[PDB]
Amino acid sequence: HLEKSAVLQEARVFNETPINPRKCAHILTKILYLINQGEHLGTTEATEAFFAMTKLFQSNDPTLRRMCYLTIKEMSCIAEDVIIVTSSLTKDMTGKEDNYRGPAVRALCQITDSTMLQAVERYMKQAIVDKVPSVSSSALVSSLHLLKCSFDVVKRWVNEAQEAASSDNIMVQYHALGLLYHVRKNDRLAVSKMISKFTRHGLKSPFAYCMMIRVASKQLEEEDGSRDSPLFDFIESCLRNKHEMVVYEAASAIVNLPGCSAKELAPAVSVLQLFCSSPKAALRYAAVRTLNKVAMKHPSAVTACNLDLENLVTDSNRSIATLAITTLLKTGSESSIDRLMKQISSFMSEISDEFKVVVVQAISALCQKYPRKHAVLMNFLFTMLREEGGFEYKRAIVDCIISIIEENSESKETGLSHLCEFIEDCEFTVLATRILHLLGQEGPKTNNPSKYIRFIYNRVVLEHEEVRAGAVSALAKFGAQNEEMLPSILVLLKRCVMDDDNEVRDRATFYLNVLEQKQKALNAGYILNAATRQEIFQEQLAAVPEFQGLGPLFKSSPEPVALTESETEYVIRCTKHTFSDHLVFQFDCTNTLNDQTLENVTVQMEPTEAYEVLSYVPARSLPYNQPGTCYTLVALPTEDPTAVACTFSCVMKFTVKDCDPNTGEIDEEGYEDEYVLEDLEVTVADHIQKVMKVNFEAAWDEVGDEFEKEETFTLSTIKTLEEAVGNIVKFLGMHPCERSDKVPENKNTHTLLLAGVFRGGHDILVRSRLLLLDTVTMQVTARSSEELPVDIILASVG
Amino acid sequence: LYTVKAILILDNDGDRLFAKYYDDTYPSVKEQKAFEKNIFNKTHRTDSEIALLEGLTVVYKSSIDLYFYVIGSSYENELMLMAVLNCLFDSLSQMLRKNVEKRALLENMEGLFLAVDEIVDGGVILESDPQQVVHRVAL
Amino acid sequence: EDIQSVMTEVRRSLGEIPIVESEIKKEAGELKPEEEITVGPVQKLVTEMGTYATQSALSSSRPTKKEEDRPPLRGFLLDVAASLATTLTKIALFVAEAMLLMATILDVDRISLCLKVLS
């Protein structure tokens, strides 16, 4: 047995020099045992123990060197001092008992601290790197726990650091990479050029391969680029060798075919499937459940029958039993075979590797593929379920019932019919509770009153004040609703059925009394229970008051622009808003880097095609991963030729301040640097409402009358609208028209006579007669109810 | 890969005479026993070719006297995983010239212990074959 | 009030399993005397600490069920003359002191503490 006490006293054994390595070791062992089994104790005593132990250390008694390692080893994230050895670690360090040296460092590292961290370091560097593979291994492990704590101390070393990871032992080679699990956690790019290194060389450890796979895979999901050759390359690689695991590993993800890859891969897979198909890799079971997914394609499915038939047949191997349920499921089944199986199952399920659990899982799947649906099956199943039984169905029922509800099943009359009956003579009060509750809600939306009543009475029939009680409670939702005959009678019934038995009496009385207390109708009720989208933005913007004009928003942006490209530290997405008077660019964001918070932020814009520039606004502070707002404001000139479409030049200014995210500091100092700000271009669709005309005929002409500018091109290398088309529907954001829009994948002639209204109120109108002689020569008209738009449309459309 | 929840060598009296939770994040000697109980009681010296419990790989074995448990995650292939488990029986057997027994267990723990740390150390299996060991060790 | 006090005392004395909402209902009656004869908000506070305690325990987690709540009325039940009284109750659905007491009582927390002590 275990107990601390003998040992502390026994520490006086330390006092002897005549000792045998055995004798002491055992004593040492005894303490360790209590602990291996489990012990808990005071530090003081531990400390003491140390001292006591520590005390002994003249020798190199090798054995002695190990035990302590253990002992020490026992302490690592919940330690007591560090310093004591120190010398001893060094002593190894100059000292060639190679062996020993390695264990000791390793413990320290969960226990570690930064100053002390300082210690090893030149050497350490060496040490990780040093000699025989053995020693090196010892070194490695040590970090990791320190990585818990941190490890960055290490980290730093890195450009330089990795390269040594270059290996010549398999075991080792495998190992190097995980540390690279975290290395790749740190970096993706690095991998990529890296891979070409991993990719570059054929590998040693099956083990090494594996991490890569996950990774490799991980990469693949969205696509790991043109895996074609790599994937392929890999594909061999996974595919064959003398180490099975890889082939399989690859296999489970890789399918690809809903009308997709199936080529080589299905055969190879088959070689495997079959090969596995009797517990080579008892692994095979899991896969079918998802890892290697199945829900088939139609001829494909027919082919599957044989393999599943082997498992189905075999009935053995825990790995087998599971396999039977998934394979059968995934591939699906005919009715008929089920029948054979039901009998098989009849024996099987109880224990046949403890079939019941796999089966409950299987069952959970059954309830799902048919959760009261193929009700005939549901009933066949139901009969069978209850029947094959044991008892273990109940658990299943919890799921099954749930499934039926999920559908909100409709062959309830029948479904319910089975349930009702069987449950009656399939017992368990507990089920009733659940079902009651559900039923409780449902009532007269599904009618069949007499039956349902018929049932209900029965349910009550059973004793239990409690059993009885549910029929009344369910009823409240029901009663209230009434059904194909109920209200009159509903009133009659509570009367007809009535009970004593005191608290059972009370239940009748009380419900009544309760009933007594409200107008039963009431009773039931209580108990039972422009100036666009963009304008909104004009207002949203409005809470600020530094304005220099606004108006009401007319239309907003046809496209928000990320003003800082992808996943940048100062990630910007920008949205632009037009009002009848001003345009505001309000800037949406995630000052990205946790490096930074940007401060003293304002936004420069500098313009080419007019706007009067009132102000650049910036956000006061922007910390990491959190929108803040900065704005830039303009007033929109409307009656000029060239005056609201503009590109503005952006430069971000800030005083850049570093962060501690743990607990920061926010101080007046910090220094600016400025980074380029992306262009803003302003559109002819941030401003416009596309329309249909108040008066096309007239308007159409009219707009010409006052307004009209023209451009002609004659098209001699291409006889297609389409280029033009890409620029026009899309740039203007207006409607192509006069039933003069439509073109199939070809068409002889086309007119878009097109619409919307521009900001500042007045309209911008376009007629594009595209004419095909067989060259295209074309008349583009822009006509407008605003001056700035006719010149604009012709440009803007591009 | 920092992947051993524990490796335990359990008696088949549900007892555990070895456990190292290499990695752990749940506790209690009791809960450990309880957890143990559900599964052990259930497997009851019987094991499986494979067993997954918790979506997690359970590779466990039995001897002729002892029950071997490793808990890991079904998130790392059998063949290897087992290989370590295999390694555990075999080396102990050869080296000692005898594999595990209840008796064996009773006379001395240490060797197991010695081995164990060497083979595995936490949630990372540093090694899984005997030989290296065999030379390496010389106790 | 004698009865009320007795009830409270016995309740304190017990604690180790049961089930009743129904009982609550049973003491109350259609009407009944409570407090001096009225202490309004303070009286709302009165309802709040005595009932809250029952509730606090209620809020806590379970083993075997005792009874899944259907205290809808429970809610009115807690909150010309008759009509006025009803209105007051609806609105609800010395006083300050009562509220404070209820807060202090707030009995899952107590149970948790006991468990910790045992550990």
PDB file of N, CA, C and O in Angstrom, chain A residues 418-475:
ATOM      1  N   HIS A 418     -49.464   2.906 -34.194  1.00  0.00           N
ATOM      2  CA  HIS A 418     -48.481   1.975 -33.710  1.00  0.00           C
ATOM      3  C   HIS A 418     -47.940   2.365 -32.373  1.00  0.00           C
ATOM      4  O   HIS A 418     -47.793   1.530 -31.487  1.00  0.00           O
ATOM      5  N   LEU A 419     -47.565   3.650 -32.232  1.00  0.00           N
ATOM      6  CA  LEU A 419     -46.978   4.154 -31.028  1.00  0.00           C
ATOM      7  C   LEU A 419     -47.845   3.952 -29.862  1.00  0.00           C
ATOM      8  O   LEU A 419     -47.428   3.453 -28.832  1.00  0.00           O
ATOM      9  N   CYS A 420     -49.092   4.375 -30.018  1.00  0.00           N
ATOM     10  CA  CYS A 420     -50.081   4.355 -29.023  1.00  0.00           C
ATOM     11  C   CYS A 420     -50.259   2.987 -28.554  1.00  0.00           C
ATOM     12  O   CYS A 420     -50.230   2.695 -27.366  1.00  0.00           O
ATOM     13  N   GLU A 421     -50.493   2.099 -29.526  1.00  0.00           N
ATOM     14  CA  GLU A 421     -50.792   0.774 -29.144  1.00  0.00           C
ATOM     15  C   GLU A 421     -49.714   0.115 -28.502  1.00  0.00           C
ATOM     16  O   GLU A 421     -49.959  -0.492 -27.509  1.00  0.00           O
ATOM     17  N   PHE A 422     -48.550   0.121 -29.110  1.00  0.00           N
ATOM     18  CA  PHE A 422     -47.456  -0.590 -28.632  1.00  0.00           C
ATOM     19  C   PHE A 422     -47.009  -0.162 -27.396  1.00  0.00           C
ATOM     20  O   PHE A 422     -46.722  -0.984 -26.578  1.00  0.00           O
ATOM     21  N   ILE A 423     -46.894   1.153 -27.227  1.00  0.00           N
ATOM     22  CA  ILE A 423     -46.377   1.779 -26.055  1.00  0.00           C
ATOM     23  C   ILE A 423     -47.186   1.249 -24.971  1.00  0.00           C
ATOM     24  O   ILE A 423     -46.656   0.686 -24.035  1.00  0.00           O
ATOM     25  N   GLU A 424     -48.496   1.228 -25.189  1.00  0.00           N
ATOM     26  CA  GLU A 424     -49.343   0.439 -24.383  1.00  0.00           C
ATOM     27  C   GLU A 424     -48.964  -1.011 -24.621  1.00  0.00           C
ATOM     28  O   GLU A 424     -49.198  -1.622 -25.634  1.00  0.00           O
ATOM     29  N   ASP A 425     -48.270  -1.644 -23.688  1.00  0.00           N
ATOM     30  CA  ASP A 425     -47.691  -2.941 -23.915  1.00  0.00           C
ATOM     31  C   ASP A 425     -46.436  -2.818 -24.671  1.00  0.00           C
ATOM     32  O   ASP A 425     -46.235  -3.477 -25.679  1.00  0.00           O
ATOM     33  N   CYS A 426     -45.545  -2.028 -24.081  1.00  0.00           N
ATOM     34  CA  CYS A 426     -44.204  -1.695 -24.468  1.00  0.00           C
ATOM     35  C   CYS A 426     -43.766  -0.677 -23.468  1.00  0.00           C
ATOM     36  O   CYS A 426     -42.605  -0.300 -23.446  1.00  0.00           O
ATOM     37  N   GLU A 427     -44.654  -0.377 -22.509  1.00  0.00           N
ATOM     38  CA  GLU A 427     -44.501   0.283 -21.241  1.00  0.00           C
ATOM     39  C   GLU A 427     -43.570   1.475 -21.141  1.00  0.00           C
ATOM     40  O   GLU A 427     -43.419   2.224 -22.102  1.00  0.00           O
ATOM     41  N   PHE A 428     -42.956   1.671 -19.940  1.00  0.00           N
ATOM     42  CA  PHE A 428     -42.027   2.715 -19.549  1.00  0.00           C
ATOM     43  C   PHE A 428     -42.718   4.003 -19.493  1.00  0.00           C
ATOM     44  O   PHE A 428     -43.146   4.594 -20.477  1.00  0.00           O
ATOM     45  N   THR A 429     -42.916   4.418 -18.267  1.00  0.00           N
ATOM     46  CA  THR A 429     -43.543   5.623 -17.915  1.00  0.00           C
ATOM     47  C   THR A 429     -42.797   6.818 -18.470  1.00  0.00           C
ATOM     48  O   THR A 429     -43.341   7.853 -18.840  1.00  0.00           O
ATOM     49  N   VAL A 430     -41.480   6.719 -18.472  1.00  0.00           N
ATOM     50  CA  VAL A 430     -40.599   7.789 -18.811  1.00  0.00           C
ATOM     51  C   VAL A 430     -40.769   8.365 -20.213  1.00  0.00           C
ATOM     52  O   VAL A 430     -40.693   9.567 -20.498  1.00  0.00           O
ATOM     53  N   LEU A 431     -41.028   7.459 -21.150  1.00  0.00           N
ATOM     54  CA  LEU A 431     -41.311   7.755 -22.518  1.00  0.00           C
ATOM     55  C   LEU A 431     -42.487   8.599 -22.692  1.00  0.00           C
ATOM     56  O   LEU A 431     -42.543   9.508 -23.517  1.00  0.00           O
ATOM     57  N   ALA A 432     -43.483   8.237 -21.888  1.00  0.00           N
ATOM     58  CA  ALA A 432     -44.761   8.834 -21.840  1.00  0.00           C
ATOM     59  C   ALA A 432     -44.582  10.258 -21.490  1.00  0.00           C
ATOM     60  O   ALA A 432     -45.285  11.111 -22.001  1.00  0.00           O
ATOM     61  N   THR A 433     -43.658  10.560 -20.569  1.00  0.00           N
ATOM     62  CA  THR A 433     -43.464  11.939 -20.194  1.00  0.00           C
ATOM     63  C   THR A 433     -43.076  12.785 -21.336  1.00  0.00           C
ATOM     64  O   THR A 433     -43.613  13.867 -21.560  1.00  0.00           O
ATOM     65  N   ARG A 434     -42.132  12.251 -22.097  1.00  0.00           N
ATOM     66  CA  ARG A 434     -41.653  13.023 -23.178  1.00  0.00           C
ATOM     67  C   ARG A 434     -42.664  13.259 -24.231  1.00  0.00           C
ATOM     68  O   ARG A 434     -42.862  14.358 -24.728  1.00  0.00           O
ATOM     69  N   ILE A 435     -43.308  12.163 -24.621  1.00  0.00           N
ATOM     70  CA  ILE A 435     -44.225  12.145 -25.704  1.00  0.00           C
ATOM     71  C   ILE A 435     -45.399  12.971 -25.385  1.00  0.00           C
ATOM     72  O   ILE A 435     -45.955  13.626 -26.247  1.00  0.00           O
ATOM     73  N   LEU A 436     -45.797  12.958 -24.107  1.00  0.00           N
ATOM     74  CA  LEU A 436     -46.926  13.651 -23.577  1.00  0.00           C
ATOM     75  C   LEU A 436     -46.773  15.064 -23.838  1.00  0.00           C
ATOM     76  O   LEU A 436     -47.690  15.742 -24.296  1.00  0.00           O
ATOM     77  N   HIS A 437     -45.572  15.535 -23.507  1.00  0.00           N
ATOM     78  CA  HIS A 437     -45.243  16.907 -23.525  1.00  0.00           C
ATOM     79  C   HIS A 437     -45.475  17.349 -24.952  1.00  0.00           C
ATOM     80  O   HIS A 437     -46.220  18.297 -25.185  1.00  0.00           O
ATOM     81  N   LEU A 438     -44.969  16.573 -25.932  1.00  0.00           N
ATOM     82  CA  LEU A 438     -45.038  16.913 -27.338  1.00  0.00           C
ATOM     83  C   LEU A 438     -46.430  16.926 -27.827  1.00  0.00           C
ATOM     84  O   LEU A 438     -46.895  17.781 -28.579  1.00  0.00           O
ATOM     85  N   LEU A 439     -47.141  15.881 -27.437  1.00  0.00           N
ATOM     86  CA  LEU A 439     -48.457  15.631 -27.878  1.00  0.00           C
ATOM     87  C   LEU A 439     -49.314  16.744 -27.483  1.00  0.00           C
ATOM     88  O   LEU A 439     -50.201  17.107 -28.245  1.00  0.00           O
ATOM     89  N   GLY A 440     -48.974  17.276 -26.297  1.00  0.00           N
ATOM     90  CA  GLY A 440     -49.527  18.285 -25.493  1.00  0.00           C
ATOM     91  C   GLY A 440     -49.684  19.437 -26.331  1.00  0.00           C
ATOM     92  O   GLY A 440     -50.747  20.018 -26.344  1.00  0.00           O
ATOM     93  N   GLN A 441     -48.684  19.781 -27.111  1.00  0.00           N
ATOM     94  CA  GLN A 441     -48.842  20.869 -28.007  1.00  0.00           C
ATOM     95  C   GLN A 441     -49.729  20.531 -29.170  1.00  0.00           C
ATOM     96  O   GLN A 441     -50.407  21.416 -29.675  1.00  0.00           O
ATOM     97  N   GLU A 442     -49.560  19.329 -29.745  1.00  0.00           N
ATOM     98  CA  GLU A 442     -50.069  19.107 -31.084  1.00  0.00           C
ATOM     99  C   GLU A 442     -51.527  19.089 -31.350  1.00  0.00           C
ATOM    100  O   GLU A 442     -51.938  19.605 -32.386  1.00  0.00           O
ATOM    101  N   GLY A 443     -52.277  18.365 -30.527  1.00  0.00           N
ATOM    102  CA  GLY A 443     -53.692  18.091 -30.726  1.00  0.00           C
ATOM    103  C   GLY A 443     -54.434  18.364 -32.047  1.00  0.00           C
ATOM    104  O   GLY A 443     -54.068  17.704 -33.015  1.00  0.00           O
ATOM    105  N   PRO A 444     -55.555  19.107 -32.098  1.00  0.00           N
ATOM    106  CA  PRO A 444     -56.441  19.216 -33.238  1.00  0.00           C
ATOM    107  C   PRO A 444     -55.956  19.732 -34.513  1.00  0.00           C
ATOM    108  O   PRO A 444     -56.776  19.805 -35.419  1.00  0.00           O
ATOM    109  N   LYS A 445     -54.677  20.106 -34.656  1.00  0.00           N
ATOM    110  CA  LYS A 445     -54.194  20.401 -35.975  1.00  0.00           C
ATOM    111  C   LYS A 445     -54.166  19.112 -36.758  1.00  0.00           C
ATOM    112  O   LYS A 445     -54.554  19.100 -37.919  1.00  0.00           O
ATOM    113  N   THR A 446     -53.888  17.978 -36.082  1.00  0.00           N
ATOM    114  CA  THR A 446     -54.097  16.688 -36.672  1.00  0.00           C
ATOM    115  C   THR A 446     -55.304  16.204 -35.969  1.00  0.00           C
ATOM    116  O   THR A 446     -55.363  16.185 -34.749  1.00  0.00           O
ATOM    117  N   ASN A 447     -56.349  15.926 -36.751  1.00  0.00           N
ATOM    118  CA  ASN A 447     -57.643  15.615 -36.232  1.00  0.00           C
ATOM    119  C   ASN A 447     -57.743  14.205 -35.725  1.00  0.00           C
ATOM    120  O   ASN A 447     -57.124  13.869 -34.726  1.00  0.00           O
ATOM    121  N   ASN A 448     -58.632  13.395 -36.331  1.00  0.00           N
ATOM    122  CA  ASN A 448     -59.014  12.050 -35.961  1.00  0.00           C
ATOM    123  C   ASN A 448     -59.463  11.933 -34.535  1.00  0.00           C
ATOM    124  O   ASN A 448     -58.844  11.231 -33.732  1.00  0.00           O
ATOM    125  N   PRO A 449     -60.473  12.745 -34.201  1.00  0.00           N
ATOM    126  CA  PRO A 449     -60.796  12.993 -32.829  1.00  0.00           C
ATOM    127  C   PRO A 449     -61.138  11.788 -32.051  1.00  0.00           C
ATOM    128  O   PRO A 449     -60.583  11.627 -30.986  1.00  0.00           O
ATOM    129  N   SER A 450     -62.047  10.936 -32.542  1.00  0.00           N
ATOM    130  CA  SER A 450     -62.526   9.866 -31.737  1.00  0.00           C
ATOM    131  C   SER A 450     -61.482   8.960 -31.321  1.00  0.00           C
ATOM    132  O   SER A 450     -61.358   8.667 -30.154  1.00  0.00           O
ATOM    133  N   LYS A 451     -60.584   8.656 -32.256  1.00  0.00           N
ATOM    134  CA  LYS A 451     -59.440   7.868 -31.986  1.00  0.00           C
ATOM    135  C   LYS A 451     -58.561   8.448 -31.017  1.00  0.00           C
ATOM    136  O   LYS A 451     -58.108   7.792 -30.108  1.00  0.00           O
ATOM    137  N   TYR A 452     -58.260   9.709 -31.207  1.00  0.00           N
ATOM    138  CA  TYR A 452     -57.310  10.371 -30.404  1.00  0.00           C
ATOM    139  C   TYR A 452     -57.778  10.395 -28.978  1.00  0.00           C
ATOM    140  O   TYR A 452     -57.024  10.110 -28.063  1.00  0.00           O
ATOM    141  N   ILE A 453     -59.082  10.631 -28.775  1.00  0.00           N
ATOM    142  CA  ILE A 453     -59.782  10.622 -27.520  1.00  0.00           C
ATOM    143  C   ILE A 453     -59.688   9.292 -26.963  1.00  0.00           C
ATOM    144  O   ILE A 453     -59.422   9.089 -25.785  1.00  0.00           O
ATOM    145  N   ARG A 454     -59.888   8.332 -27.868  1.00  0.00           N
ATOM    146  CA  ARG A 454     -59.991   6.973 -27.550  1.00  0.00           C
ATOM    147  C   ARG A 454     -58.732   6.601 -26.870  1.00  0.00           C
ATOM    148  O   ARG A 454     -58.724   5.931 -25.858  1.00  0.00           O
ATOM    149  N   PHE A 455     -57.617   7.090 -27.436  1.00  0.00           N
ATOM    150  CA  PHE A 455     -56.314   6.863 -26.942  1.00  0.00           C
ATOM    151  C   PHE A 455     -56.200   7.427 -25.636  1.00  0.00           C
ATOM    152  O   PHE A 455     -55.624   6.818 -24.769  1.00  0.00           O
ATOM    153  N   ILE A 456     -56.618   8.687 -25.554  1.00  0.00           N
ATOM    154  CA  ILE A 456     -56.257   9.530 -24.491  1.00  0.00           C
ATOM    155  C   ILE A 456     -56.776   9.042 -23.264  1.00  0.00           C
ATOM    156  O   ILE A 456     -56.085   9.080 -22.267  1.00  0.00           O
ATOM    157  N   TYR A 457     -57.969   8.486 -23.352  1.00  0.00           N
ATOM    158  CA  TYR A 457     -58.618   7.922 -22.253  1.00  0.00           C
ATOM    159  C   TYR A 457     -57.815   6.837 -21.685  1.00  0.00           C
ATOM    160  O   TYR A 457     -57.680   6.697 -20.486  1.00  0.00           O
ATOM    161  N   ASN A 458     -57.257   6.039 -22.566  1.00  0.00           N
ATOM    162  CA  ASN A 458     -56.471   4.902 -22.233  1.00  0.00           C
ATOM    163  C   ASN A 458     -55.267   5.249 -21.497  1.00  0.00           C
ATOM    164  O   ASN A 458     -54.792   4.507 -20.659  1.00  0.00           O
ATOM    165  N   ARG A 459     -54.678   6.380 -21.861  1.00  0.00           N
ATOM    166  CA  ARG A 459     -53.402   6.754 -21.346  1.00  0.00           C
ATOM    167  C   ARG A 459     -53.506   7.075 -19.927  1.00  0.00           C
ATOM    168  O   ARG A 459     -52.785   6.595 -19.055  1.00  0.00           O
ATOM    169  N   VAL A 460     -54.629   7.742 -19.678  1.00  0.00           N
ATOM    170  CA  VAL A 460     -55.035   8.060 -18.379  1.00  0.00           C
ATOM    171  C   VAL A 460     -55.287   6.813 -17.658  1.00  0.00           C
ATOM    172  O   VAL A 460     -55.019   6.802 -16.480  1.00  0.00           O
ATOM    173  N   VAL A 461     -55.852   5.753 -18.325  1.00  0.00           N
ATOM    174  CA  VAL A 461     -56.508   4.594 -17.716  1.00  0.00           C
ATOM    175  C   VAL A 461     -55.595   4.108 -16.662  1.00  0.00           C
ATOM    176  O   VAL A 461     -55.974   3.979 -15.502  1.00  0.00           O
ATOM    177  N   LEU A 462     -54.319   4.043 -17.024  1.00  0.00           N
ATOM    178  CA  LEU A 462     -53.295   3.653 -16.139  1.00  0.00           C
ATOM    179  C   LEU A 462     -53.287   4.431 -14.892  1.00  0.00           C
ATOM    180  O   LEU A 462     -53.555   5.617 -14.826  1.00  0.00           O
ATOM    181  N   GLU A 463     -52.860   3.773 -13.832  1.00  0.00           N
ATOM    182  CA  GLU A 463     -52.850   4.425 -12.589  1.00  0.00           C
ATOM    183  C   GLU A 463     -51.655   5.257 -12.628  1.00  0.00           C
ATOM    184  O   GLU A 463     -50.851   5.172 -13.546  1.00  0.00           O
ATOM    185  N   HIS A 464     -51.612   6.117 -11.645  1.00  0.00           N
ATOM    186  CA  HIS A 464     -50.653   7.095 -11.491  1.00  0.00           C
ATOM    187  C   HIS A 464     -51.567   8.157 -11.705  1.00  0.00           C
ATOM    188  O   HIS A 464     -52.035   8.398 -12.801  1.00  0.00           O
ATOM    189  N   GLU A 465     -51.604   8.965 -10.691  1.00  0.00           N
ATOM    190  CA  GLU A 465     -52.126  10.263 -10.624  1.00  0.00           C
ATOM    191  C   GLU A 465     -51.409  10.949 -11.707  1.00  0.00           C
ATOM    192  O   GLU A 465     -51.993  11.541 -12.586  1.00  0.00           O
ATOM    193  N   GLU A 466     -50.116  10.732 -11.735  1.00  0.00           N
ATOM    194  CA  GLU A 466     -49.265  11.293 -12.674  1.00  0.00           C
ATOM    195  C   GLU A 466     -49.580  10.934 -14.100  1.00  0.00           C
ATOM    196  O   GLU A 466     -49.595  11.807 -14.945  1.00  0.00           O
ATOM    197  N   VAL A 467     -49.873   9.672 -14.437  1.00  0.00           N
ATOM    198  CA  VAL A 467     -50.143   9.221 -15.773  1.00  0.00           C
ATOM    199  C   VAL A 467     -51.381   9.787 -16.245  1.00  0.00           C
ATOM    200  O   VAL A 467     -51.545  10.176 -17.389  1.00  0.00           O
ATOM    201  N   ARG A 468     -52.295   9.880 -15.310  1.00  0.00           N
ATOM    202  CA  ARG A 468     -53.589  10.362 -15.557  1.00  0.00           C
ATOM    203  C   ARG A 468     -53.539  11.827 -15.949  1.00  0.00           C
ATOM    204  O   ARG A 468     -54.255  12.361 -16.812  1.00  0.00           O
ATOM    205  N   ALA A 469     -52.698  12.538 -15.195  1.00  0.00           N
ATOM    206  CA  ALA A 469     -52.541  13.959 -15.249  1.00  0.00           C
ATOM    207  C   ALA A 469     -52.169  14.530 -16.582  1.00  0.00           C
ATOM    208  O   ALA A 469     -52.558  15.651 -16.918  1.00  0.00           O
ATOM    209  N   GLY A 470     -51.333  13.795 -17.339  1.00  0.00           N
ATOM    210  CA  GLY A 470     -50.803  14.248 -18.600  1.00  0.00           C
ATOM    211  C   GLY A 470     -51.851  14.450 -19.647  1.00  0.00           C
ATOM    212  O   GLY A 470     -51.799  15.399 -20.431  1.00  0.00           O
ATOM    213  N   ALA A 471     -52.863  13.565 -19.669  1.00  0.00           N
ATOM    214  CA  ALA A 471     -53.924  13.618 -20.628  1.00  0.00           C
ATOM    215  C   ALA A 471     -54.635  14.912 -20.472  1.00  0.00           C
ATOM    216  O   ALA A 471     -54.908  15.564 -21.474  1.00  0.00           O
ATOM    217  N   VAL A 472     -54.874  15.343 -19.210  1.00  0.00           N
ATOM    218  CA  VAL A 472     -55.455  16.668 -19.031  1.00  0.00           C
ATOM    219  C   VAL A 472     -54.538  17.775 -19.491  1.00  0.00           C
ATOM    220  O   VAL A 472     -54.956  18.707 -20.169  1.00  0.00           O
ATOM    221  N   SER A 473     -53.246  17.737 -19.175  1.00  0.00           N
ATOM    222  CA  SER A 473     -52.413  18.858 -19.551  1.00  0.00           C
ATOM    223  C   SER A 473     -52.224  19.065 -21.048  1.00  0.00           C
ATOM    224  O   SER A 473     -52.120  20.185 -21.531  1.00  0.00           O
ATOM    225  N   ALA A 474     -52.124  17.971 -21.810  1.00  0.00           N
ATOM    226  CA  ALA A 474     -51.913  17.949 -23.227  1.00  0.00           C
ATOM    227  C   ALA A 474     -53.050  18.626 -23.928  1.00  0.00           C
ATOM    228  O   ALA A 474     -53.003  19.438 -24.864  1.00  0.00           O
ATOM    229  N   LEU A 475     -54.167  18.297 -23.313  1.00  0.00           N
ATOM    230  CA  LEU A 475     -55.484  18.666 -23.617  1.00  0.00           C
ATOM    231  C   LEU A 475     -55.616  20.131 -23.624  1.00  0.00           C
ATOM    232  O   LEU A 475     -56.459  20.630 -24.337  1.00  0.00           O
TER     233      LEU A 475
END
